[PDB]
């Protein structure tokens, strides 16, 4: 029932001459905004993606990032010269806040380098990873020496971040509370051993990500029931496949049980024969 805000940032620096920075934002499991290196504005996908903020409470933010986009790039360009970093460069930044019931919450700001995070933001000062290289330490000093930025960030994690979330939940509850009924079926998989076959349980086109699915013999949960990873789709409804290796003679009375919020106890009744 928790819906964290994940602001995602991707910035690649192949050579000194060329770079691109794009970013987006996830709430819980939904995308609201896209932002290219080509666009001077962040794109509100939903009509309610703007939340409660007026076109000025909104544009104000666009003024910051647009400057922040330009600002961030030179820094790292000169950063690398100070730090002698063999190009190319890949930097990722995960950030946001998550609210607790009532008027309490917590924030975060995790930056990563070449698929390995470097530093975070604790309280009112920059703090590196306990498993971070040293050069990061000298870099930690430099950034802490720009306070207005340090302040500018707390003003966002502390405070302004959560209010906007509240300005979205009231604007997006309808989409938020939406539920989608899955579409399930069965199919044969190639045999993983002699006689013993692989029984596949298919689930597709549902909404709220979290679901529990197990292959069962009426009511007996089958250990061999193995499933893969939940995977997306174009309209935000996901997909999943659960498998099981059993012998043909044991396929009598077997059934795949499907448990998800979209139905409440009217589970997908699929015994072996459909």
């Amino acid at each position, epitope marked *: 029932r928790l819906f964290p805000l994940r602001c995602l940032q991707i910035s690649s620096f192949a050579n000194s001459s060329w770079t691109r920075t794009d970013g987006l934002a996830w709430l819980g499991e939904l995308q609201t905004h896209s932002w290219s290196n080509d666009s001077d504005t962040v794109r509100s996908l939903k009509p309610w993606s703007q939340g409660t903020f007026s076109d000025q409470q909104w544009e104000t933010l666009q003024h910051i990032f647009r*400057v922040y986009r330009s*600002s961030f790039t*030179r*820094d790292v360009k*000169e*950063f690398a*010269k*100070m*730090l*002698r970093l063999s190009y190319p460069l890949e930097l990722q930044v995960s950030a946001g806040c998550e609210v607790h019931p009532g008027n309490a919450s917590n924030n975060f700001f995790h930056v990563a380098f070449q698929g390995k995070d470097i530093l975070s933001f604790q309280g009112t000062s920059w703090e590196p990873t306990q498993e971070a290289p040293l050069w990061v330490n000298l870099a930690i*000093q*430099v*950034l802490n*020496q*720009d*306070k*207005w*930025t340090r302040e500018t960030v707390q003003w966002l994690l502390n405070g302004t971040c959560p209010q906007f979330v509240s300005g979205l939940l009231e604007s997006g509850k309808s989409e938020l509370k939406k539920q989608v009924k899955p579409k399930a079926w069965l199919s044969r998989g190639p045999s993983p051993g002699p006689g013993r076959l692989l029984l596949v349980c298919h689930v597709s086109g549902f909404y709220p990500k979290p679901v529990w699915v197990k292959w069962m013999r009426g009511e007996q949960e089958q250990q061999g029931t193995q499933p893969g990873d939940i995977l997306p789709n174009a309209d935000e409804t996901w997909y999943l496949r659960a498998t099981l290796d059993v012998v043909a003679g044991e396929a009598a009375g077997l059934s795949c049980r499907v448990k998800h919020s979209s139905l409440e106890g009217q589970d997908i009744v699929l015994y072996w024969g459909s």
Partner: T-cell receptor
Amino acid sequence: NQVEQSPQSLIILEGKNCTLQCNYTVSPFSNLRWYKQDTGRGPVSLTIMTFSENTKSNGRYTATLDADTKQSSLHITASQLSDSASYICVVSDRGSTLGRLYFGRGTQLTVWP
Amino acid sequence: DIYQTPRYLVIGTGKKITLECSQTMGHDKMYWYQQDPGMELHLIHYSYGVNSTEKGDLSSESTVSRIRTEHFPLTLESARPSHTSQYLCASTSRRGSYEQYFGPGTRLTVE
């Protein structure tokens, strides 16, 4: 240029008070610095005002700043003879050790007795 | 403090240039500037660290080297009259009151 300084040359009397202005167009902005170069010697750091710090003084010198109009001034009082040198207006477009420095064309004054 | 030698110097065209600088405040970053008399300032090189040496907005034939934190001496291979100006090693502290500190300066003349 991204930082215009005014006026170029000015002449005043000993014991008088006058002002030095500086106008900048640089985006972004972090801090403003007025410097004083002794003729034939290295210039010296005087006022180092962030954009919150509107005013600041070091002795008989008192500089001002209005970032909203992107305009700096510099007030000195009771001009002594030793005040005669060239004066500069410097802006850093970052607060940490990465900002490019945007010097003004430079003004020079003369305090006559 | 911050020291750079020598205040004055004169040499023949096409010869190699002796330019020194020293610093006793342990600052990591140092500078070099070019000012022609009566005109404004111009940046030419800088070093963010001990092993860094970078070029500035003005493309010039200078030879900015830095192998030591204290010494940040500039060198120049071949002399030429258009180089006649003043040159100012500079320094800043790694933390707070970034009072850009300047050296005394050196006067350059070179047929």
